[PDB]
Amino acid sequence: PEYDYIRDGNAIYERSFAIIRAEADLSRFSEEEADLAVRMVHACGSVEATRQFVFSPDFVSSARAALKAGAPILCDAEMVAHGVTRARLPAGNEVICTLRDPRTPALAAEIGNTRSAAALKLWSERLAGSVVAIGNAPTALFFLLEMLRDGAPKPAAILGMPVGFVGAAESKDALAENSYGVPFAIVRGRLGGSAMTAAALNSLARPGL
Amino acid sequence: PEYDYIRDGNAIYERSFAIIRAEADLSRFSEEEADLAVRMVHACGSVEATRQFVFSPDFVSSARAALKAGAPILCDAEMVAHGVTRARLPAGNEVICTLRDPRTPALAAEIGNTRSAAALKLWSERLAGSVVAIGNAPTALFFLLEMLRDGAPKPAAILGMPVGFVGAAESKDALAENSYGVPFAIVRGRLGGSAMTAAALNSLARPGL
Ligand SMILES: C/C1=C2/N[C@@](C)([C@@H]3N=C(/C(C)=C4N=C(/C=C5N=C1[C@@](C)(CC(=O)O)[C@@H]\5CCC(=O)O)C(C)(C)[C@H]\4CCC(=O)O)[C@](C)(CCC(=O)O)[C@H]3CC(=O)O)[C@@](C)(CC(=O)O)[C@@H]2CCC(=O)O
Ligand SMILES: C/C1=C2/N[C@@](C)([C@@H]3N=C(/C(C)=C4N=C(/C=C5N=C1[C@@](C)(CC(=O)O)[C@@H]\5CCC(=O)O)C(C)(C)[C@H]\4CCC(=O)O)[C@](C)(CCC(=O)O)[C@H]3CC(=O)O)[C@@](C)(CC(=O)O)[C@@H]2CCC(=O)O
Numbered sequence: 001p002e003y004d005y006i007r008d009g010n011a012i013y014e015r016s017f018a019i020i021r022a023e024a025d026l027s028r029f030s031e032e033e034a035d036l037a038v039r040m041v042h043a044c045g046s047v048e049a050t051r052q053f054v055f056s057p058d059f060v061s062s063a064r065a066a067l068k069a070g071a072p073i074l075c076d077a078e079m080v081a082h083g084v085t086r087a088r089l090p091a092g093n094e095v096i097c098t099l100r101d102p103r104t105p106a107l108a109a110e111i112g113n114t115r116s117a118a119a120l121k122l123w124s125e126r127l128a129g130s131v132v133a134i135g136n137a138p139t140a141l142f143f144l145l146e147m148l149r150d151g152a153p154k155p156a157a158i159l160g161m162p163v164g165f166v167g168a169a170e171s172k173d174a175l176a177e178n179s180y181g182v183p184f185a186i187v188r189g190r191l192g193g194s195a196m197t198a199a200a201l202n203s204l205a206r207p208g209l
Numbered sequence: 210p211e212y213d214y215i216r217d218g219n220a221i222y223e224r225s226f227a228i229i230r231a232e233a234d235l236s237r238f239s240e241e242e243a244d245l246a247v248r249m250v251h252a253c254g255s256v257e258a259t260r261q262f263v264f265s266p267d268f269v270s271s272a273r274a275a276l277k278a279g280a281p282i283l284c285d286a287e288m289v290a291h292g293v294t295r296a297r298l299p300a301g302n303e304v305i306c307t308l309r310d311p312r313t314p315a316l317a318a319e320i321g322n323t324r325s326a327a328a329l330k331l332w333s334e335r336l337a338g339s340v341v342a343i344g345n346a347p348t349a350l351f352f353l354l355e356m357l358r359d360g361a362p363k364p365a366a367i368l369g370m371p372v373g374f375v376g377a378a379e380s381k382d383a384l385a386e387n388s389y390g391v392p393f394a395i396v397r398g399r400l401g402g403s404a405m406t407a408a409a410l411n412s413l414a415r416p417g418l
Contacts, residue, residue: 001358001387005351005376007322012348012375019374045372045399046255079288079403113216139221142214149210163254165228166221167214178210190254194288195402 013209016042023047032060036185036203043083043199052191054176056157056183063131063157063183064204067093071156073201074123075099076116077136083198088206095201098122117143129156131204135197138162138171145171148180158184159200163192222418225251232256241269245394245412252292252408261400263385265366265392272340272366272392273413276302280365282410283332284308285325286345292407297415304410307331326352338365340413344406347371347380354380357389367393368409372401 006012017038024047026034037050067073068090075081075097084095098104098119107118116137123132127147132155134140141160148154160175162168172186187196215221226247233256235243246259276282277299284290284306293304307313307328316327325346332341336356341364343349350369357363369384371377381395396405 001354001383003351003355003383005348005379007326007348009323009348012323016374042374043372043402045374045377045401078291079407082287082291083403114218114221117216139214139216139218142212145210146212163252165225165251165254168254170214174210174212192254193252193402193404194292195404198288 010209017209020047024050026050029053030055030060032064032207035207036060036200039199039203040196043195044193049187049191049196052187052189053185054188055185056176056179059157059183059185060204063159063185066129066156067131067205072096072126072130074126074130074132074155075197076119076134076140076162077194079194080133080135080197080201083194084201084205088202090205093205096123096126113143114139116140120144120147127153127155131155131157131159131201133159133161133197133201135159135161135163135192135194138164138167141171141175142167145174145178145180148182149178152180154180154182156182158182159197160184160186161192161197161200163187163190163196165190168192219418226418229256233259235259238262239264239269241273241416244416245269245409248408248412249405252404253402258396258400258405261396261398262394263397264394265385265388268366268392268394269413272368272394275338275365276340276414281305281335281339283335283339283341283364284406285328285343285349285371286403288403289342289344289406289410292403293410293414297411299414302414305332305335322352323348325349329353329356336362336364338363340364340366340368340410342368342370342406342410344368344370344372344401344403347373347376350380350384351376354383354387354389357391358387361389363389363391365391367391368406369393369395370401370406370409372396372399372405374399377401
């Protein structure tokens with residue numbers, strides 16, 4: 001056979017974002033949130049995810065604000081962390097994920113949680129005005145919420161986009177319910193994911209393409 | 210507030226796979242393919258993806274066959290590669306991805322393709338009975354198909370699960386149309402993804418949990 005497919009990524013990129021814009025309904029989204037929406041949709045191939053996207057009044061502004069002023073991303077997974085295209089970061093923003101950190105399994109044990117959650121303890125001195133990215137683990141999100149309630153230092157924003165069938169749904173609305181003084185963004189419901197999260201990060205740290 | 214969420218991953222894992230089995234329709238799937246289906250669904254939070262899953266008669270058998278006999282996974286992305294839980298691999302199967310390889314951008318240039326595709330050239334001496342994993346890039350899939358047509362050495366199987374709005378759809382059915390003598394597995398349509406792919410890999414390299 002003779003394959004007549006496109007071999008130019010930017011071309012691909014151009015017609016990809018194009019097809020999407022042409023299909024996803026992005027009306028209620030802020031000219032800036034939209035960007036977020038479309039790559040998110042891009043990364044997942046689902047034009048409907050948009051249905052669940054939810055950004056606190058100033059989420060984009062304040063995170064894009066911070067991700068621009070240097071603020072570190074704190075990924076709950078590594079898929080997410082490896083979805084962030086360094087080449088697109090405003091100011092070499094750190095993509096941190098202590099999931100596979102040597103002391104997380106033990107923090108999980110003594111405190112009684114999950115690696116993804118205990119991991120947040122290693123975040124202890126990096127919450128300060130940062131952009132949290134949890135696109136894989138709701139316990140992490142719930143744990144992050146307790147910290148805050150118990151006198152913790154509010155991050156710059158909170159990407160509550162973990163994906164799941166157990167706990168993700170609640171963790172996320174809980175973020176929305178009482179986010180202890182910080183903006184958020186979540187994909188309410190079961191949907192979420194490293195791709196969408198990273199995609200969202202990618203959108204934030206640099207609009208368009 | 211007082212959060213009453215579950216902090217035990219295996220518990221989470223137990224009720225996650227449980228909720229799914231309880232919701233996804235897995236009838237036409239092979240008792241073994243099913244496993245694949247459910248984690249895939251797990252990784253994405255979409256019970257419907259199953260609708261698009263498609264495995265060539267012997268895909269599972271021959272890849273699980275190979276992934277068991279040592280056969281290397283050749284990831285087209287790094288998200289996918291970082292979704293493979295080493296802890297679950299049959300025999301330390303290599304998770305290879307030459308996307309971020311120093312010579313790919315140049316292979317893309319001289320031959321006129323995309324990194325993800327030219328990258329496959331670095332696969333040249335690893336196609337031999339291997340399990341290809343393309344959960345991010347259809348040009349890679351199309352390119353892989355040309356190689357085969359032009360006298361290339363058939364991989365052990367082919368995970369045609371790239372996700373996309375341009376080319377992914379065709380690349381995938383093309384895999385199905387003429388896969389040059391090798392089994393496949395694709396998520397027909399736009400859906401696919403590193404998670405689902407990796408999830409699928411994870412399922413293959415070790416059933417259940
Ligand atoms: C960043 C990125 C890249 N994608 C590449 C691989 C690019 N993708 C592709 C595709 C078809 C695609 N991509 C995707 C997603 C993401 N892709 C992304 C993400 C994070 C974008 C977002 O949503 O924010 C998202 C996955 C979120 C995460 O996993 O967390 C889709 C799955 C949606 C897919 C679909 C396109 C379509 O068919 O419409 C390309 C065009 C080729 C494959 C093919 O044609 O089949 C490739 C570049 C090249 O090879 O020249 C990459 C190296 C591109 C670049 O040069 O800028 C860059 C990583 C740079 C680096 O290593 O730092
Ligand atoms: C492998 C894996 C892990 N997931 C962990 C992080 C585990 N997940 C979780 C979740 C809530 C989840 N997970 C997911 C997916 C995958 N998860 C996977 C994948 C690849 C499974 C598959 O589909 O094949 C898939 C993502 C495919 C890819 O990205 O390519 C979902 C997104 C579906 C999510 C949903 C669960 C639910 O709510 O129903 C756990 C339970 C905690 C977070 C929370 O409760 O909020 C965590 C372990 C722990 O902390 O004890 C991990 C370390 C688990 C382990 O110990 O075995 C292991 C990686 C080991 C390693 O580092 O090698």
